[PDB]
Write a protein that binds this ligand. Structure first.
Ligand SMILES: *[C@@H]1O[C@H](CO)[C@@H](O)[C@H](O)[C@H]1NC(C)=O
Ligand SMILES: *[C@@H]1O[C@H](CO)[C@@H](O)[C@H](O)[C@H]1NC(C)=O
Ligand SMILES: *[C@@H]1O[C@H](CO)[C@@H](O)[C@H](O)[C@H]1NC(C)=O
Lengths: 277, 49, 98, 271, 93
């Protein structure tokens, strides 16, 4: 049916428009050379989300805390040295020194021998520049921004069953399309869970994604790239760049044995070989 | 001390070269390109340019 | 635009200047004036001149980049805070005399 | 594009030498004039110095308060002074280490410093490559041809070692191979603009029984995820720290600890 | 027992919270107002640091000379460094 039926039954010569490459077409007709790198991709809901501040290991890395404990021991030892001269800062020196990092402790007794005052001054200047570096790390945390994909690729464990995870979702393709044959030759259960989740129009599927009538959708890569390049709302940054996908091209179907094929291939390589493509 | 010299052939590219080539594409005139040896752009030195 | 490091920058965009242009000088009485003028307007009139400007004008050093030029120091800020400090010395003198 | 940023954070000594001397002379003059105001009342010197360091310092310390009928005004001015200093310093150090990112790259073939080259941007390619033919066909790429023909190399790994030794400044090459080298060597980053999206297939003869079935077998390898498995084997398979910054800070802290212990030996020897 | 006129020094020393030992407030209402004032001071400090960071981000650039009719273009003795500028010889400029 369609363009394949027009070319095989020879009511046309060739098909110029966007056309996928699979086994059955190469059985019935002959492709040209591919001129554009066009695989498949998946458009999902992909909302705003957060910046995910899970854990930070940049300022201390679980080893500056060793220096914290070492200088706590040093300050406790010199507090014992101050107590030699002259008053509960033997074991309380840890709470005194590390409670004044966050500058809100109860005011503990401090000696007039200036020794504890000097080391609290040094530790406190270190804590001030440490809090400055901490606020600087939180300020430089704004520089990166990326909400991660909920689905890594076509081999997702979500794609095994939407009931396997806590939210149920939905995904579709085009009716009577080549992507149906592309999936059913590899994953029949994908089609079995997809058949209830069909749709009619590609822009209609986009509206169903925007209005919440659809969660995911599978189509060609560059077409969804164009739809992201014309999107109103700009909530669509697609899943990767075609990593775990079909990764094919677009070609021109000719008759099996047409004399135009070599000339069309040379013309396409000329059109790529000068930047005009 | 002397005024004898040679006419060295040299290559020319740039913006105004492209302007000249496109005017030769449009107006269809053959350029006779050479450089100035009198000096700089131009100045009326005692009623002499 | 070819300034390595984007150091040398012109003053704005040429505001307080002569504001002239480049042309093609011909002899007084040349018959090629009108055709060359119409050809130049044709080159303006199709963006081919704009194609040559895109090809032959570098544009890396944009206007007013927000780069590393902030050298972690201002001089005038603590200077004005020192003027406020001198006002504090004056108020301390006023409170000390009475 | 691999040059380390904020190796020492410019705290006092890589920074210009005003602020330590300025704050020290400021707190010295403030402590002297407040002690002289305490003399003309409308361990007193040690109490004034401790109050000056504590108000300048902002952590919390069990100190007293002298006779400050007019000195508390100068103390609250000094308090606002100290917090606006530490706030300005924290803010501009943070905001300087946010915007510390130049454009060290080329951003694709459309670079007029590569259209009009120099002796600095050394870009080349493999000698006798198809990239050379592709740049020899096009009408406005002969200048880059003249630049690259002086320094073409026999193999690509020679260029890898040369730019590893920084003997090259740029290198035109296929995308995924340089991505693989980025996975191998982390000191190699490509540019963003992708130009001349091409294809790599199998070199074949003329009309042959292996002309059709080999293409059918490649299509058979593309319809399943065997190419994705090969990508998993080779393509996907990749390879303010306060330790360069605050290491010397800790060393000067420990030196201050030892010097302060010796000064306290001197102080107990006197008192 | 002395926080009548000394409350101003207490307050604008605890605007910044720069370790100012003042007094022990036995009044509960005074402690509640100090807590509200301290929360106000914390959010004011955050707003002021954000203002300083955004003013670094909003980075304008002043110029030395913004005109051919400048008073600097009268005499370089008008300021302490004598600056210098020339043109090309025998030029239209
Ligand atoms: C596909 O084509 C058939 C032809 O009869 C049509 O009835 C059907 O609605 C189409 N939709 C599907 C199942 O893809
Ligand atoms: C190519 O494959 C076909 C089956 O598709 C097979 O019959 C043939 O022997 C193969 N090679 C030749 C000789 O064309
Ligand atoms: C500029 O003009 C003078 C006029 O005598 C001439 O002698 C000189 O060669 C010219 N060249 C320079 C220095 O620009």
């Amino acid at each position: 049916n369609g363009m394949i039926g027009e070319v095989v039954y020879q009511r046309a010569v060739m098909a110029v428009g966007s056309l996928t490459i699979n086994e059955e077409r190469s059985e019935v007709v002959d492709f040209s050379v591919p001129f554009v790198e066009t695989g498949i991709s998946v458009m999902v809901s992909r909302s705003n989300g957060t910046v995910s501040p899970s854990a930070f290991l940049e300022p201390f890395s679980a080893s500056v805390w060793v220096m914290m404990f070492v200088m706590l021991l040093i300050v406790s030892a010199i507090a014992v040295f101050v107590f030699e001269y002259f008053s509960f800062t033997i074991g309380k020196a840890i709470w005194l020194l590390w409670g004044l990092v966050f500058n809100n402790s109860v005011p503990v007794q401090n000696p007039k021998g200036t020794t504890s005052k000097i080391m609290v001054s040094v530790w406190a200047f270190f804590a001030v520049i440490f809090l400055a570096s901490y606020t600087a790390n939180l300020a430089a945390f704004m520089i990166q921004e990326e909400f991660v994909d909920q689905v890594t690729g076509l081999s997702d464990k979500k794609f095994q069953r939407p009931h396997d995870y806590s939210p149920p979702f939905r995904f579709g393709t085009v009716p009577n399309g080549s992507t149906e044959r592309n999936i059913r030759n590899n994953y029949p259960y994908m089609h079995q869970y997809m058949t209830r989740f069909n749709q009619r129009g590609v822009e209609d599927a986009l509206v169903s994604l925007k209005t919440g009538k659809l969660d995911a959708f599978i189509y060609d890569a560059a077409v969804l790239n164009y739809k992201a390049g014309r999107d109103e709302g700009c909530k669509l940054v697609t899943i990767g760049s075609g990593y775990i996908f079909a990764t094919t091209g677009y070609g021109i179907a000719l008759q099996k044995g047409s004399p135009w094929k070599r000339q069309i291939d040379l013309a396409l390589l000329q059109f790529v070989g000068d930047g005009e493509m | 001390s002397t005024n004898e010299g040679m006419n060295v052939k040299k290559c020319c590219k740039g913006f105004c070269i492209d302007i000249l080539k496109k005017l030769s594409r449009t107006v269809k005139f053959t350029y006779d390109l050479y450089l100035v040896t009198n000096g700089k752009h131009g100045k009326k030195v005692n009623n002499v340019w | 635009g070819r300034d390595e490091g984007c150091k040398l920058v012109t003053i704005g965009s040429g505001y307080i200047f002569a504001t002239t242009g480049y042309g093609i000088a011909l002899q007084k009485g040349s018959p090629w004036k009108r055709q060359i003028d119409l050809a130049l307007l044709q080159f303006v009139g199709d963006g081919e001149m704009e194609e040559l400007e895109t090809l032959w004008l570098t544009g890396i050093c944009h206007n007013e980049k927000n780069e590393v030029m902030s050298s972690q120091l201002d001089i005038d800020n603590m200077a004005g805070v020192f003027y406020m400090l001198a006002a504090a010395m004056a108020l301390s003198l006023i409170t000390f005399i009475w | 594009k691999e040059i380390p940023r904020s190796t020492l954070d410019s705290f006092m000594q890589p920074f210009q030498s005003t602020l330590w001397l300025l704050v020290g002379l400021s707190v010295h003059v403030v402590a002297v004039m407040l002690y002289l105001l305490d003399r003309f009342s409308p361990l007193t010197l040690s109490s004034a110095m401790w109050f000056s360091w504590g108000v300048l310092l902002n952590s919390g310390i069990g100190e007293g308060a002298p006779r400050s009928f007019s000195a508390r005004i100068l103390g609250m001015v000094w308090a606002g002074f100290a917090m606006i200093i530490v706030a300005s310093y924290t803010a501009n150090l943070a905001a300087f280490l946010v915007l510390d990112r130049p454009e060290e790259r080329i951003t694709g073939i459309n670079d007029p410093r590569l259209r009009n080259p120099s002796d600095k941007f050394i870009y080349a390619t493999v000698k006798q490559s198809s990239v050379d033919i592709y740049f020899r066909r096009q009408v406005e790429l002969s200048t880059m041809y003249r630049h690259m023909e002086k320094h073409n190399y026999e193999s690509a790994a020679e260029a890898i070692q040369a730019v590893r030794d920084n003997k090259l400044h740029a290198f035109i090459w296929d995308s995924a191979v340089l991505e693989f080298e980025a996975s191998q060597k982390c000191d190699l980053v490509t540019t963003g603009e992708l130009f001349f999206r091409s294809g790599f297939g199998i070199g074949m003869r003329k009309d042959s029984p292996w002309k059709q079935n080999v293409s059918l077998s490649i299509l058979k390898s593309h319809e399943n995820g065997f190419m994705e498995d090969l990508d998993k084997t080779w393509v996907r398979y990749q390879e303010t720290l306060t330790f360069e910054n605050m290491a010397g800070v800790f060393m000067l802290v420990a030196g201050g600890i030892v010097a302060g212990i010796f000064l306290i030996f001197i102080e107990i020897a006197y008192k």
